[PDB]
Amino acid sequence: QNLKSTDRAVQQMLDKAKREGIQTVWDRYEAMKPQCGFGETGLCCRHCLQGPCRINPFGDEPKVGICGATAEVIVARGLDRSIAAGAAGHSGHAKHLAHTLKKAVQGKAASYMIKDRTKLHSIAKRLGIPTEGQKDEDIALEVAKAALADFHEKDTPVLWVTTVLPPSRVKVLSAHGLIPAGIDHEIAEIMHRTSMGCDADAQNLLLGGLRCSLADLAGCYMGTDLADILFGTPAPVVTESNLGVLKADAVNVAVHGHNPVLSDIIVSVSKEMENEARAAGATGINVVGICCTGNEVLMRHGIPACTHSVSQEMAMITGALDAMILDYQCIQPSVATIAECTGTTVITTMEMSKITGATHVNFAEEAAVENAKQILRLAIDTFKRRKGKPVEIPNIKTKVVAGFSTEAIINALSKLNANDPLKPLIDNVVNGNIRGVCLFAGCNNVKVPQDQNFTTIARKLLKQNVLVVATGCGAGALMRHGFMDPANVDELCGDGLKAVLTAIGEANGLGGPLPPVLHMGSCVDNSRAVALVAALANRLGVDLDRLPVVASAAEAMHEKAVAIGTWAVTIGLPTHIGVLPPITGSLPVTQILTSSVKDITGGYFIVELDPETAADKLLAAINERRAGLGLPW
Amino acid sequence: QNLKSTDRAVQQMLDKAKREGIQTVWDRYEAMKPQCGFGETGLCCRHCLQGPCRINPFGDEPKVGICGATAEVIVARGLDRSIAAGAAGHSGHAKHLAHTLKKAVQGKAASYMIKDRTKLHSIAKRLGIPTEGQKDEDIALEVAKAALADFHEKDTPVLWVTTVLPPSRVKVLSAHGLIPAGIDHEIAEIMHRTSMGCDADAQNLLLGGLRCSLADLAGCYMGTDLADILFGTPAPVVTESNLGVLKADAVNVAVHGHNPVLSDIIVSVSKEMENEARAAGATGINVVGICCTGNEVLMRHGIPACTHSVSQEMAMITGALDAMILDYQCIQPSVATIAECTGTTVITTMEMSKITGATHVNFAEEAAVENAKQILRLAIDTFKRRKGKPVEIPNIKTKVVAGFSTEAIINALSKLNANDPLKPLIDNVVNGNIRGVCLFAGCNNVKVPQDQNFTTIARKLLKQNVLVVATGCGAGALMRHGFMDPANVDELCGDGLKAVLTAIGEANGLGGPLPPVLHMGSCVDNSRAVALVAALANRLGVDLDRLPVVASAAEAMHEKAVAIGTWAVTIGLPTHIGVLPPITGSLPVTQILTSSVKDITGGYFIVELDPETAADKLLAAINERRAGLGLPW
Numbered sequence A, B: 001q002n003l004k005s006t007d008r009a010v011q012q013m014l015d016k017a018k019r020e021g022i023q024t025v026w027d028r029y030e031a032m033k034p035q036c037g038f039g040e041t042g043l044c045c046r047h048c049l050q051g052p053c054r055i056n057p058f059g060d061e062p063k064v065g066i067c068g069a070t071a072e073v074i075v076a077r078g079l080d081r082s083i084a085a086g087a088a089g090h091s092g093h094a095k096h097l098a099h100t101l102k103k104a105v106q107g108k109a110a111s112y113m114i115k116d117r118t119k120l121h122s123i124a125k126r127l128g129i130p131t132e133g134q135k136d137e138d139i140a141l142e143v144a145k146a147a148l149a150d151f152h153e154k155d156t157p158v159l160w161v162t163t164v165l166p167p168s169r170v171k172v173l174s175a176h177g178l179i180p181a182g183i184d185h186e187i188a189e190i191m192h193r194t195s196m197g198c199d200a201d202a203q204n205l206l207l208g209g210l211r212c213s214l215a216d217l218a219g220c221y222m223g224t225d226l227a228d229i230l231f232g233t234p235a236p237v238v239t240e241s242n243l244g245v246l247k248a249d250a251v252n253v254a255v256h257g258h259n260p261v262l263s264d265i266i267v268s269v270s271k272e273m274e275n276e277a278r279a280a281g282a283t284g285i286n287v288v289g290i291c292c293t294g295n296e297v298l299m300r301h302g303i304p305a306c307t308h309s310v311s312q313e314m315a316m317i318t319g320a321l322d323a324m325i326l327d328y329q330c331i332q333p334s335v336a337t338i339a340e341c342t343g344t345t346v347i348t349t350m351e352m353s354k355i356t357g358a359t360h361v362n363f364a365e366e367a368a369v370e371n372a373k374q375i376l377r378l379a380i381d382t383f384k385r386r387k388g389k390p391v392e393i394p395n396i397k398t399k400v401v402a403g404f405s406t407e408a409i410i411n412a413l414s415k416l417n418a419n420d421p422l423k424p425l426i427d428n429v430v431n432g433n434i435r436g437v438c439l440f441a442g443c444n445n446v447k448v449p450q451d452q453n454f455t456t457i458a459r460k461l462l463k464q465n466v467l468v469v470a471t472g473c474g475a476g477a478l479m480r481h482g483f484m485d486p487a488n489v490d491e492l493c494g495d496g497l498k499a500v501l502t503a504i505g506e507a508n509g510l511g512g513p514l515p516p517v518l519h520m521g522s523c524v525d526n527s528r529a530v531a532l533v534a535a536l537a538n539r540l541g542v543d544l545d546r547l548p549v550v551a552s553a554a555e556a557m558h559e560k561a562v563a564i565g566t567w568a569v570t571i572g573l574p575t576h577i578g579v580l581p582p583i584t585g586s587l588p589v590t591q592i593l594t595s596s597v598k599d600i601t602g603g604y605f606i607v608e609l610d611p612e613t614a615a616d617k618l619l620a621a622i623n624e625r626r627a628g629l630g631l632p633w
Ligand code: SF4
Pocket: A045, A046, A047, A048, A049, A050, A051, A052, A053, A065, A066, A067, A068, A069, A074, A195, A196, A197
């Protein structure tokens, strides 16, 4: 099973699924092989009813689409639609939060409130919304209105791009026409320009894609901002991860999907319902996280992470998962079928994301606590039904220190330099104790043995003194393999990095180091890494494409990960992707995305499926950036 | 060549392309066969990087997507993205016009103006914008602002849906949650919900698709409204169609694409530049239309239609097409390559729609006349270069009476009943002289011999006394085969229909009938058919799904045609589609779209590739509607 996942708890559950005859994602992948090479290379188009069109990567006809679309057009159009789809998910998430903040401060959703007033005011200030003399609710109404306004054209560009990157970067982007006019505007324009008989120039299409990726960045940054306002900015927390966080004698409830609007209320209403659960024979309600909504409540509340991404069905296979509470994105719809075998109650909550066979409980922010109670009573009923059934929870977990929002990182560094917190970090980049920074982001992918690329790359970079930060299921992968346990710093980190993590942790009174990898949150909280990197660029007076900072979507899957990778390139980062995106069928598109975009944004994709080679390539990119700053490497 | 096209001028040009070795769309289709059956049936998904996933229509594995997406989910998700893409094109078009109207009345685009003040005021009144005491420019600014506001969420739903359908229809739609909240909002929500791990219930997905199709209807209706304001509401015109409208001794300029913002200025600036063209040796500039922008200037100015859709390359093969001026949508990008052989100057004008190898001349509304002159001088230069070259313009054209906006139809009928213009039409539906109404819409498709389905179906319906109206390339097909020439009424029309077309034409002083088919304009001007049908529903006090009105996208191609077909169903019409959409891989999705949606919206798709059978099925749908009104049939 280690060919499927490197996570030992997942391996144990794959053995249980196998002997119980429960089909998993890996089994459905095997059943799909060999996969279509036209689709794998990007040389397939179904954009009109004259299709499907495909183009042989090599050989004879077909060489061109029926309408005359070339390989480079077809590849670029498909990629652009992926970016637009990713942007549509993160900005649906962000819009959900904007509407929740608005309802809350309009007195329409009393379960929600301004928790982080300081962040509310800083965001207002960043957007140019006056705060002096204003009620918090009015400031928040104006921030929510500004959030919603960024979805459409108006007399300013998308402010969750132009106000979150340094002016020099905005200028570069504007010079190439890449600043988004409106988040949903760009999504629609991508769908328009990529429809039949429209844009048919690869560079033009890909410039549109870069712009739409910044609409995705805006949605991510907006979602982090709004979720921090509503639910609190993360600070360092200690918890655990992997399936051993499930407890046979508790009602185990996973929150799964993405939006803390749902997850965060499940967490505190579950505390309220402890005696109800104890009346049912349980010790209490054990909320555990799956996927980004699990990252959200891990970061803010220390809720333990059960699993992530590709292995999400395995939590159900334990037999102890009483409920899986879903909102949207990245939920394998297989879970509704597996629930029939495992007894888990799968509950959908959002009208635009239902799964046949799952129970749907409309969640309305206006009724959040009551809706959460209904949902949790289904979970308790389910717990009662498995009274006396054996379960198989692997007794496998790791310790996870997390909660490293950018604010938390700055605060930690401020213990070393109170009025110039970034300087101790930059000092150690300059003296070589920190070689550079790498952000691990994005998914697992069934094509890659789960977590192998993240851990292989992260080990090599940590030994080379790279400061590693992670989000989403990259953070999930690293947490489940111990990379967020400070007890593993000696093993994992180069001496320079160890010295820095120790100096920071000791100054923060830990009696020990920060963990080897800093968990910066969910995938929208990639925006926190942008905030940190933009702050470093501003502090250094250079653009982001001069910083020794890279990104790696080492096991990417979702359209959202494609969008994040593309905005990472657009804001100036060398960006590794560890799975093949459907671009190999066009050399001109590949050359743009891996080479000539350097002349446009300074960032570039590094496509590399072999993780040791990817680590080398990421180190070379970091070291090239070091050299260009005149630093030793 | 008649297996490729039933148009004799196209056949002649296919012979010329063949002996000159110029590859055409039909040759690229042949090179694509056999096409992928997974894509053809809809059983392919590339929504994440674990894909491509496919499902065998029948047999053994693969049976399910890697994430657990079933066939019905995958089919419904792909269809929904097609609808969203269609909506994105029509609403990009409509947004373009809204921005042009705004610039014009802000003094920023002097080449544009309020031409149809009456329509401006009626639209304002329909939207609830006060006109009394207001300057036209202010009313128009408010209409443009309302147009732009319909793209995003706000405190009203999309008014270019709710104000253009009768209240009883809006109520039905609202009861099912189908009224769009914002045009680009719905497009993005479709892209979100159809991304991996999101919506996975076919009925839920398809309800989202119906709603997004109404966002497409809104974009169409908005585009017609705004184009009528800016360029004038069509009234009956007489012109010609097919390749014989090209003139060897003139500078032949085709306008191609969709937006009259461009086409309409090409038309009047070309009149200005007659002596310039005559100085170059030409008799003048002969502007001819291709595709919907050609329909727009045909409807408003009687510009002759050269060709449409699938045969658009054939205009270039004549050797006489000096320029092809493009904005966006439905332009085969092959034209840029063919231009190298034919000498035609292909000129793109919109930043989001470029074609490698074409000359790009930025068109800015603010500089429209100057930009048009630059474009037309390229055309004259090209004419000069073919001094002495033989050309082969087939001497084949038809007479086309067109310009039947809904206003024009009502006005025509008012000659028979001044204060109740719809009543003479309804009287003849009741007495059986008009059996029902059929709207032909949408594209040609290389899979169907060009125009064969439109003409075969239209002949059968006309003999059965159906009032036939047409838009887009369905109007193009029928015009190029004589169905818009009143000289063919005796041949084509049943006695009852003939009696009605004659009575109306004689009352309009024609000394003869209206033509056999009424051309209601471009594809956004399908909205004119909605206006007519909604007016009939209102006049009769019944919803649209009780009217003997059907639609046929007999040779559909574009995602836009899928969106139009879907909103035709959503507003209550039996809607034929004459090509296979990628739904056959899921019986549950097919059953929803062809049967159980009747219980939701009263409309339904009729998938039928055989046009004689399609005509029978459309007549049965009309006659069922007649029976349900208690009428003989
Ligand atoms: S858009 Fe062009 S390449 Fe794509 S399916 Fe249609 S004809 Fe084929």
